[PDB]
């Protein structure tokens, strides 16, 4: 009885999604079309199974149990992570992230690795309160720290000069390397690497199976390294 079948009997696919993610899965301010990578992937996906998506919103609080309770056949992209496996299924991944630094590109063979960053004499800009900022009294315990309040973003003291480095998720990190061609990365890989899934139910091995076997074939030809590019963004190795 797998939702495969329910699925294509229905000319049907149920997609949950928070659509709050730029550029991810968005609603487009004035007509309230859904937009972004995912949606994308989603559009090709139903479109290769013969089938019309219909989107079901839901928000990071509850977009697991909306999985678990059948609201929706699959989940637009998130963190695979140990916990959500107890109770949700992940569909094999296409997108790999992690923490990375930013520099101005001037200061590149100066601050060349993780290492570089982390020395009395450098200063650290960082967003107060966040799980970003404990990141980096982790990495760069000997450096100085500038701990500013949102609205004021972090990345702004590095161009301005008041910082040396920052750090910020690598797909961040993309987005603002391509906005400020003046920042780069500090090219010493990543930490905490993790990777964007979708979810699919956990007891329905038939239906995790054929977006796993979708996923392949599209893989074979390119496809998600090509969507990726179509948004500027860009997969961890
Ligand atoms: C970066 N992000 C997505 C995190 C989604 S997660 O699956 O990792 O829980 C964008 C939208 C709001 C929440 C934070």
């Given at each position: 009885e797998s939702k495969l079948d329910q699925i294509l009997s229905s000319g049907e696919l149920k997609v949950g999604t928070?659509?709050?993610?730029?550029?991810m899965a968005m609603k487009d301010p004035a007509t309230n079309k859904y937009k972004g990578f995912d949606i994308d992937v989603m559009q090709e996906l139903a479109k290769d199974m013969g089938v019309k998506i219909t989107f079901v919103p839901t928000e990071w609080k509850t977009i697991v149990s909306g999985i678990t309770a059948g609201r929706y056949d699959i989940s637009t992209s998130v963190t695979k992570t140990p916990k959500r496996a107890e109770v949700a299924g992940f569909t094999d991944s296409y997108y790999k992230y992690g923490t990375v630094p930013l520099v101005l590109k001037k200061n590149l063979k100066k601050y060349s690795t993780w290492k570089s960053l982390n020395n009395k004499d450098v200063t650290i800009a960082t967003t107060l309160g966040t799980s970003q900022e404990e990141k980096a009294k982790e990495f760069f315990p000997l450096s100085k720290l500038q701990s500013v309040e949102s609205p004021?973003?972090?990345f702004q003291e590095v161009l301005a000069g008041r910082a040396d480095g920052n750090i910020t998720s690598s797909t961040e990190a993309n987005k603002l390397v391509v906005k400020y061609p003046q920042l780069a990365i500090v090219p010493d890989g990543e930490k905490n690497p993790a990777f964007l899934a979708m979810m699919v139910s956990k007891n329905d091995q038939v239906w995790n199976d054929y977006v796993n076997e979708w996923i392949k074939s599209k893989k074979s030809s390119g496809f998600f390294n090509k969507l990726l590019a179509k948004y500027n963004l860009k997969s961890l190795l």
């Open positions: 928070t659509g709050d993610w730029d550029p004021a973003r972090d």
